[PDB]
Amino acid sequence: ADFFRIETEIQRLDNPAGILANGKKCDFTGACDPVVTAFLDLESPLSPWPGSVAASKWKTIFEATDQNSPTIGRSVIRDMCGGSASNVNLRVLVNDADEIGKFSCLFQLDARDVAMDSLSAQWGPSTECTAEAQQGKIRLFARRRAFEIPSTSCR
Ligand SMILES: [Mn+2]
Ligand SMILES: [Mn+2]
Numbered sequence: 001a002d003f004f005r006i007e008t009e010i011q012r013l014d015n016p017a018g019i020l021a022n023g024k025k026c027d028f029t030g031a032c033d034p035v036v037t038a039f040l041d042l043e044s045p046l047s048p049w050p051g052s053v054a055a056s057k058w059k060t061i062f063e064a065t066d067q068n069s070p071t072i073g074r075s076v077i078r079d080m081c082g083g084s085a086s087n088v089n090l091r092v093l094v095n096d097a098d099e100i101g102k103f104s105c106l107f108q109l110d111a112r113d114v115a116m117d118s119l120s121a122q123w124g125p126s127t128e129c130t131a132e133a134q135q136g137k138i139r140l141f142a143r144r145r146a147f148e149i150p151s152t153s154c155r
Contacts, residue, residue, distance in 0.1 A: 013036070020100055
């Protein structure tokens with residue numbers, strides 16, 4: 001499988017205390033205003049956060065006002081073209097619209113994981129991402145799928 005697509009879904013953020021990574025409240029009369037930026041790290045997945053590419057260069061995928069624990073439902077897509085990758089890491093930053101949490105959902109990419117095609121690429125299990133701070137207090141969940149694509153479709 002020398003040409004394949006990785007899609008990772010940031011499923012949901014849970015912040016019952018409505019706090020920041022520094023542990024104070026996002027909003028003292030309201031809830032967090034979470035802004036989600038993310039990036040699927042193929043080149044330095046086993047390195048410390050942020051990995052290969054700096055957070056400030058990531059695309060904004062989800063936004064919300066006064067929802068500590070929003071459902072997200074949004075994908076980050078990456079393609080491995082012309083060779084093999086053994087894992088990938090969905091690096092996520094969450095800010096209060098100010099750091100809520102830096103997360104890392106590392107994902108194996110063994111042969112098991114990359115389906116022969118898109119229709120046969122079932123989502124894998126929901127996985128909790130690793131946070132820099134507030135482990136278990138501010139949680140982020142995400143799942144992966146991967147499937148072979150034709151080379152002319154690989155970005
Ligand atoms: Mn797709
Ligand atoms: Mn707010």
